[PDB]
Amino acid sequence: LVTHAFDDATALSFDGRQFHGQVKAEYYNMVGPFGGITAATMLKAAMSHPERLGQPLALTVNFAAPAKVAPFVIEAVPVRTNRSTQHFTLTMMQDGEVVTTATAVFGIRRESWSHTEAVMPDVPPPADVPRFVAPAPLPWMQWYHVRLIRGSAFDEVQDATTYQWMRDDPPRPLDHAALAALCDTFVPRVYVKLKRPVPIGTVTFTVYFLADPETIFRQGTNELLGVARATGFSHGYFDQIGEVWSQDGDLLATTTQLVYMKAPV
């Protein structure tokens, strides 16, 4: 029996009222844990809830304050339940104070007419792209295999747009929470733009899972292509818009991020 780190970080227990977990120090980022893991964690809670029906649709996580690397507690309410659809409200506490909050939508979906409006960019295969290793690694970075295509802080690239191949490392089958996490695996837009770091932190993170659950699972350990772009940077904040595609060209999820930023003049 071997535990994958991810399943290890997001491991929870239910006492019948609240969920218990530990912030893993191995997922640390700066000034608190990697956002994607915290969000994946926020999602399992509702997923592991007994009342929970259907599969995930959307997730919005708001980081109220950087989580200590401590045990924490999550209280996940099945706030509304309808035929095909379900809404959750979640709260994570450490030492009696609110650390993180999230809302989620679960639902049972059936097949419809489908089309894909966005274009998948034309890119080389994971074969041709070399894995990218940062000179100063972040603890959680070790948990992902990223082949960077364009858009880094080392690039000559003058816009904010990033392309990357990414998967869990070591390889892990794909599911919803893992997928949420992969959406915070993007280098902060602002670094990409300035080629040097500034202090930043994420206030809020949203993710929509566009692909039906079956499609998502289909990927198994196959690598994925993320695309993160930025919109603007003003008066202390900026935003990240991003998409995640299957190697086949199927659009898996879309995400947005609102991020505090410290750059003065």
Site map for Cl ion, 29-58, x if CB under 5 A?
A: ---x--------------------------
Q: Which two tokens stand for residue 66?
A: 């950087």
Report residue 94 as tokens: 């450490």
Please give the residues from 112 up to 171 whose contact with its own copies meets the rule CB under 8 A. 112-118, 159-160
Extract the tokens encoding 140. Answer: 């959680």
The helix/strand/coil state of 139 is helix
Q: Which of 25, 30, 95, 109 binds its own copies (CB under 8 A)?
A: 109
CA angle 46-248-154, nearest 5°? 85
**Of residues 216-245, those binding Cl ion (CB under 5 A):** none
- Whole-Å CA distances, 86 to 15, 39, 112: 22, 18, 20
Question: Which of the ranges 39-47, 167-175, 180-188, 208-216 carries the binding residues for its own copies, by CB under 8 A?
Answer: 208-216
| Chosen from Cl ion, its own copies, none, partner binding at 32 (C-beta under 5 to 8 Å by type) | Cl ion
Chain breaks in the chain (C to N over 2.5 A) after: none
Of 223, 129, 130, give the one whose Cα is nearest residue 185: 223
CB 259, min distance to Cl ion, A: 10
Q: Site mask, Cl ion, residues 144-183, x = CB under 5 A?
A: ----------------------------------------
Contact in structure between 182 and 242 (CB atoms under 8 Å)? no
Quick check: bond before 50 cis, omega within 30?
Answer: no
Compute the distance between CA of residue 141 and CA of residue 216 in angstroms, rounded to an integer. 23
Taking CB under 5 A as the criterion, the residue among 14, 28, 208, 260 binding Cl ion is 208
Interface with its own copies includes 208 (CB under 8 A)? yes
Residue type, 173: P
62 with 100: CB under 8 angstroms? yes
Q: Which of residues 54-113 bind Cl ion (CB under 5 A)?
A: 63, 89
Query: By CB under 8 A, is residue 91 in contact with its own copies?
Result: yes
Q: Which of 70, 79, 133, 134 binds its own copies (CB under 8 A)?
A: 79
Closest C-alpha among 215, 206, 209 to residue 246: 215
48, 89, 152, 222: which one binds its own copies (CB under 8 A)? 89
The residues in 211-230 that bind its own copies, with binding defined as CB under 8 A, are: 211-212, 215, 229-230
Maximum Cα–Cα distance across the chain: 54
**Interface residue list for its own copies (CB under 8 A):** 57-58, 60, 62, 64-65, 79-80, 82, 85, 87, 89, 91, 97-99, 101-103, 105, 107-118, 159-160, 189, 193-194, 203-204, 206, 208, 210-212, 215, 229-239, 241, 243, 251, 254, 256, 258, 260-265
